[PDB]
Amino acid sequence: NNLRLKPWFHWTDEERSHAIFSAYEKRILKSEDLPSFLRANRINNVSTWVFPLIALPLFNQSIFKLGFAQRILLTRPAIEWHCFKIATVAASWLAWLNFSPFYRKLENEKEYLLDTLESRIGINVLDLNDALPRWTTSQEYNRRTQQLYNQRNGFFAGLLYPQEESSRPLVDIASFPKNLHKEKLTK
Amino acid sequence: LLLYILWLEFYQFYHILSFYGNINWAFDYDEYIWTLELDTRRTRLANNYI
Amino acid sequence: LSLINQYKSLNLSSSIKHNAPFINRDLYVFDDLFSYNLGDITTKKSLFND
Amino acid sequence: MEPFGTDERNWTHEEKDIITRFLKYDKHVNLKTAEMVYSAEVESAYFGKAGALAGGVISALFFNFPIVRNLPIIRRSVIGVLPFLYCYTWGKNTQEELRWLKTFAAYQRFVVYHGQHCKLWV
Amino acid sequence: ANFVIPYLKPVADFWNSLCIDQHQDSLFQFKGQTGSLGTDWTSKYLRSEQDVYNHKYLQYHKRVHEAPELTDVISDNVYRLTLFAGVERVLSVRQAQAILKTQFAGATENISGAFQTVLNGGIFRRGYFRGALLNLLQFCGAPYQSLIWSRNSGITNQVIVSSIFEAFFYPLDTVKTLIYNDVQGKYKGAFHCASQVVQNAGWSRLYAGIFQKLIFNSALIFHLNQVWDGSSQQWASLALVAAAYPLLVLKTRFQVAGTPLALATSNEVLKVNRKTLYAGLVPYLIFNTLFAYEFAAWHSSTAQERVIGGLQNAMKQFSSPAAEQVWSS
Amino acid sequence: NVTGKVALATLGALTGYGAFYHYNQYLNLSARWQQIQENIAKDQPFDVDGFDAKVYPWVRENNVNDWEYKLVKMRGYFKDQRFFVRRKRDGKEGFLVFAPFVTAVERVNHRLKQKDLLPVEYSVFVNLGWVPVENKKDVELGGEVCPPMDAPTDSTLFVNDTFTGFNPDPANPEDTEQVTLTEITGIVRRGEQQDILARRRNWNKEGIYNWVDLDYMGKIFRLFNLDAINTAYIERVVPSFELYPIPATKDTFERPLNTPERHSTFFNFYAATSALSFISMLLL
User: Fold this and answer.
1) Is A167's CB within 8 Å of F199's CB?
2) Phi and psi dihedrals of F185, rounded to 5?
3) Furthest-apart CA pair in chain C: how many Å?
4) Taking the alpha carbons of E188, E189, E193, E196 in that order, is the dihedral positive or negative?
């Protein structure tokens, strides 16, 4: 409705990626929901480490031949020219990273997966979030999801890696004994 | 030798401070489960002074 | 490990028949030795003692 | 119940084992005392294995120590196995001591439970 | 917790698995009941303390009756193959020491000399653990397959099957013996040594002492069967093995004879001094007495009865010493 | 050259020995399977009643190989929990369904009015059948595997049994001793073992199970007679016709891992490898 706050309205990119990875690992998300998102993920990676390359000659034809750039080139040492070129390319790279069409597509795919999760488990989608490690990134969690997809949807499934189909026992969780007591320690 | 004496004294000191929380196991025959119960302790006052 | 030779025999009936102080139960005289009016017996009836 | 004094005989291994198996399985023993002996048995078992394994690792390292590695085989073997023997003995002694201290606590609890100590009453 | 514990914690888990009773710990993990009595902590502890000897009995039952498994046999004889695998090389060097030039490189003609010759190379591939993988392969080949094809057999059938399989796998034994005795490390591996022997002496040179090995294996099998049964004939079998040991010494000398590893050619192996026939008798007997082969498949009725009776006697401790003899119970 | 010849000879010898071993195992397994099929087609189930229902004959004598694939019949009440093991039947993916089956109940409480003690239940694992991965959600908790056994016609049989402790009384005055007995017939089969190369490996933490681990199945369900559970399990076999799980019949009971087909495939592979090694050695 655009006025209802989704449960993940405050999550960061790392938190969203970890939620998707945990949902897939816990067999809440099937391998049939990933192939689009995963694809976008790969494109996003190519959209990150290729842009400076794509931006290196283009500027040489568009920006670095302008009057200000030529003035810098002709009236300043070669090291300052290198500094100007590197600073311009790095600023363009940062702007691309913040505002990239493929980054937007990846975020949309993650949002669709989170919407599917909310449609499946309801408000318990918030239970997929945790206190993530500080230096683990959204790309790292996406790569872990891709690795899990390759393990499950490929060879060695059932030999080296757990299968995607769960075989958990059928019990009544209301009456089945639990490991943790409500307040005390039990043995 | 001082390190050895330090470990021995710390071991005894830790035991003494561990006296004052009575932690026991209680069996619940209705639930057939053991639980960890915490309680206070009563002892002769000379023990507390020493 | 404890069941290796713990249960030698399982049939109480054979030991009862070969050792109890009662006359052999396979005798053919027990069919028409005495005469009773038993009426109609449409269900398996068992006799109790003493 | 046990005699007390300097001249008295210390608990022998057979007596300790008999008392342990009495406290574990006999009736006339409350559930708490038996649970104490059971917890003694469970926790003590780690230390014998831990001592033996740590001694094995340390002896494997010591068999190649800078001076040990250049000794004749008999001296090298003795010096290499010394750490294993020391740590194995430490593990066994610690296991026995922990288990018997908890078992003797359970025995004292049983004696007080059945009032079998003179000069002890509620 | 993010960079070190993910690597340190598995080591601690392995240490605890080696130290803590795994069956009892796993039993304690499932705390609760689902309609049955005896699933509380006390009953689980009691059955776990009775489950040690039951598990020993079940392992022995699997070894005796069911088809043998390589892992079970290896774990049954783990000390011969993993830790003291270099003692096999020491014994081989001692047996072949009479013609092996080791007396001319910092070693004497005794067990200490063989130990130092083995340990001079190091503690690894060039030293103590040289041929250890070949030893493991030989154990997986000859004795394990002999157990597989004669599971519950009399001593004669055991000897027949073992002789057949030792004859089939003998070239591996020759290669292992040659790899044991190259102090200078001429051979880079089993395949390289076999190739050199075949190229320089032909295929038939891999069967130098096969008959001596077969006869000594017959004697050793008889001794092992007498040991497993616990009979009083253990000393007679030890005397028989002591008498047959020169066959093993001659086997090793014939195996290493023609190669450049030895001073004496094959025709000169029987010209060696007679006093050297019992080269490593006492060390070999001590090593086999300490870590002898444990083939529970080949255990006879007496051995099975002895083991199971020992377990049953060990199961008699689970009762109160001060148990009242009650009239009604 | 010479090294290649030596390697080829060693490989040929090893593969020829492997082929010979697999051929002999194939012959033995085919003979035993023919014997098993004949015995099953005889169809004379062994009634497990009385003392045999408390401690089972394959537990008491510890001879499961003498009782393997063996027709038995036993009565009791299934427990609610179900266990799923990943398996393929007739070339399609599915799950084997196991349920606890209480064949004897023991009551050890003498303070009946003061205390309501839980009974000591002796149970065995029964393989109810096979359900495909699509219909695993169609297996119901506490479902009716078999219709309950008919009430006996002898009025003296309505008391608690001496050994099993079961009362075949539909209207029992003792409410706490009221039991419903269903009678199943199946074949005794032994438990399975781990074989990673056979893709029979189970991750207990993740809930993925590929082989029948009777020890873990007994521990997780908090069952009592863990040893008598680990010894073997009974695979339920319906008489002639087999909705979920689909029970096994006299011709479609779950095949063991070691099969004559498997050993024939191994023999063919090893014989081909040995022949190729010898051909290459001859060429060189």
Assistant:
1) no
2) -125, 140
3) 57
4) negative
**Unique residue bearing structure tokens 């043998």:** E68
Of chain D, the end-to-end C-alpha distance in Å amounts to 18
| E contacts of B33 (beta carbons < 8 Å) | 31-32, 40-41
Q: Please list, in sequence order, all residues whose beta carbon lies within 8 angstroms of the beta carbon of residue E255, skipping any fewer than 6 positions away.
A: E96, E173, E174, E177, E178, E208, E209
Both tokens of E264, joined, read: 């004496």
Q: Which residue has the tokens 């910092």?
A: E106
Mutant choice from B30, B31, B32, B35 vs E, greatest count of E C-beta within 10 A: B32
| CA E144 to each of CA A101, D121, E140, E162, E167: distance values in angstroms, whole numbers, following the listed order | 65, 67, 5, 9, 14
Shortest CA gap B19–chain A (Å): 20
Whether F196 and A159 lie within 8 Å, measured CB to CB: yes
Any bridge partners for residue F233, and if so which? F189
A185:B35 CB<8 A: yes
Q: In which region does residue A107 sit, left (phi positive, over 0), alpha (psi from -120 to 50) or beta (all else)?
A: alpha
Rounded CA gap, F101 and F99, in Å?
6
The CA distance from F198 to E249, in Å, is 44
Alpha helices in chain E, H assignment, sequence order: 5-19, 22-29, 41-64, 70-76, 78, 85-96, 111-120, 132-149, 155-168, 170-180, 190-201, 210-229, 234-257, 281-290, 301-314
Which three-class secondary structure state does DSSP give residue E208? coil
CB neighbours (10 Å) of residue E232?
Answer: 8
Give the C-alpha distances (Å, rounded to integers) separating D22 from A107, B33, D9, D106, E24.
69, 24, 20, 11, 22
Query: Which chain E residues are closer than 8 Å to A133 by Cβ?
Result: 2
Phi first, then psi, for residue F248 (nearest 5°) are -75, 155
- D-chain CB neighbours of B42 within 8 Å are none
Of F141, F196, F203, the CB nearest to A170: F141
Shortest Cα distance from B15 to chain E (angstroms)? 25
Resolved by? cryo-EM
Q: Using CB atoms, which residue from F55, F153, F156 is nearest to C46?
A: F156
User: By the 8 A CB rule, do A93 and A48 touch?
Assistant: no
Contact A186 B35 (CB under 8 A): yes
Q: With b meaning 16 or more CB within 10 Å and e meaning fewer, what string describes E16-28?
A: eeebebeebeebe
Say if CB E297 and CB E63 are below 8 A apart: yes
Task: Say if C4 is an interface residue toward chain E (CB within 8 Å).
Answer: yes
- Distance from C-alpha of E86 to C-alpha of E128, rounded to nearest angstrom: 5
- The reported resolution of this PDB entry, expressed in Å, is 3.0
Cβ atoms E285, E238 nearer than 8 A = yes
Give me the count of residues in chain D: 122
C11 Cβ under 8 Å from any chain F Cβ: no
Cross-strand pairs, F98? F83, F127
Contact indicator for A59, A89 with CB cutoff of 8 Å: yes
Nearest-by-CA chain F residue for C3: F60
How far apart (Å, rounded) are the C-alpha atoms in residues F184 and F46?
12
Cα of A59 vs its chain's centroid, Å: 30
Give the single-character DSSP code of D9.
Answer: P
Q: In whole angstroms, give the CA distance from residue A138 to residue A110.
A: 11
| CB neighbour list of residue F80: distance below 8 Å, 6 or more residues apart | A171, A172, F141, F142
Angle F13-F19-F23 (CA atoms, 0-180°, nearest 5)?
145
Q: In angstroms, rounded to a whole number, what is the distance separating the alpha carbons of residues D106 and D91?
A: 23
- E208-E211-E214-E219 Cα dihedral, nearest 10 degrees: -120
Q: Which residue of C has its CA nearest to F55?
A: C3
Check CB contact of B34 with chain E, cutoff 8 Å: yes
* List of chain B residues whose C-beta atoms are within 8 Å of the C-beta of residue E37: 32
